[PDB]
RNA sequence: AUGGAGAGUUUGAUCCUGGCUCAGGAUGAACGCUGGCGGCGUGCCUAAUACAUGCAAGUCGAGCGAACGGACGAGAAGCUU
């Protein structure tokens, strides 16, 4: 189930010699609670198509987040442009404490044991990019030991 | 490594950069208005300004002179026994 989360409504006014438009764009985050997470937007007007074309746009790319279960396996961060996020793994019995673009990809993957020091910008585009571009750069233990050519259980 | 999200703010409309502002805590707090009872702490932060009065360091006859009062036998009676 491609779990939806909206960010905002919008209005854009292109002042010309004539008249300005009433485009109502948006941007959403679409995860699945499995470690296969996307996000999407669209220059739309319809609040359904603000979801629908963007849910279609998020289903242009669901990124593969490797999840050693129970939390996010490492103490990680994010990076895009002028913004950057941060995640520290923690206990399960906490209650998730994060924000708007830093909680979004973190809650639609079912992990719930993390931190959030959302550094960088306040523009949610490159923020939720950094929430995604950091998270896509995650790696597990078993594939890297395959990639390095050691064994999996040799790493502790 | 038990924590680390914030809210706005330069346009006709964006990104950056920037300070600024509030959301949250506390105070020997104090003030406007309010005010049940206990169980509890704290109590001139200013003038180390000036002070009436009370008033706050004494000690021991088992040191020994004194001297006083003075119980203490305490006469004859001062005969008002």
Automatic annotation (TrEMBL):
Native source organism of the sequence: Staphylococcus aureus
Domain S5 DRBM: 2-65
Gene3D superfamilies, per the entry: 3.30.160.20, 3.30.230.10
Description of how the protein assembles with itself and partners: Part of the 30S ribosomal subunit. Contacts proteins S4 and S8.
Source superkingdom: Bacteria
SUPFAM superfamilies registered for this protein in UniProt: dsRNA-binding domain-like, Ribosomal protein S5 domain 2-like
Signal peptide: none
Pfam families linked to this entry: Ribosomal_S5, Ribosomal_S5_C
Domain comment as written in the entry: The N-terminal domain interacts with the head of the 30S subunit; the C-terminal domain interacts with the body and contacts protein S4. The interaction surface between S4 and S5 is involved in control of translational fidelity.
GO biological process, one term: ribosome biogenesis
Keywords: Ribonucleoprotein, Ribosomal protein, RNA-binding, rRNA-binding
Entry's family note: Belongs to the universal ribosomal protein uS5 family.
Gene Ontology terms, MF aspect: rRNA binding; structural constituent of ribosome
Reported function: With S4 and S12 plays an important role in translational accuracy.
GO cellular component term, pick one: small ribosomal subunit
Name the UniProt record assigns to this protein: Small ribosomal subunit protein uS5
């Amino acid at each position: 189930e491609f779990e939806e989360r909206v960010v905002t409504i919008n209005r854009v006014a292109k002042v010309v010699k004539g008249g300005r438009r009433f485009r109502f764009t948006a941007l959403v985050v679409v995860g699945d609670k499995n470690g296969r997470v996307g996000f999407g937007t669209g220059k739309a007007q319809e609040v359904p198509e603000a979801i629908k074309k963007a849910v279609e746009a998020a289903k242009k790319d669901l990124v593969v987040v490797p999840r050693v279960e129970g939390t996010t396996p490492h103490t990680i961060t994010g990076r895009y442009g002028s913004g950057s996020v941060f995640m520290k793994p923690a206990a399960p019995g906490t209650g998730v404490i994060a924000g708007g673009p830093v909680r979004a990809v973190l809650e639609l993957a079912g992990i719930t044991d993390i931190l959030s020091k959302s550094l960088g910008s306040n523009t949610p585009i490159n923020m939720v990019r950094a929430t995604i571009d950091g998270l896509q750069n995650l790696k597990n233990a078993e594939d890297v030991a395959k990639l390095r050519g050691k064994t999996v259980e040799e790493l502790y």
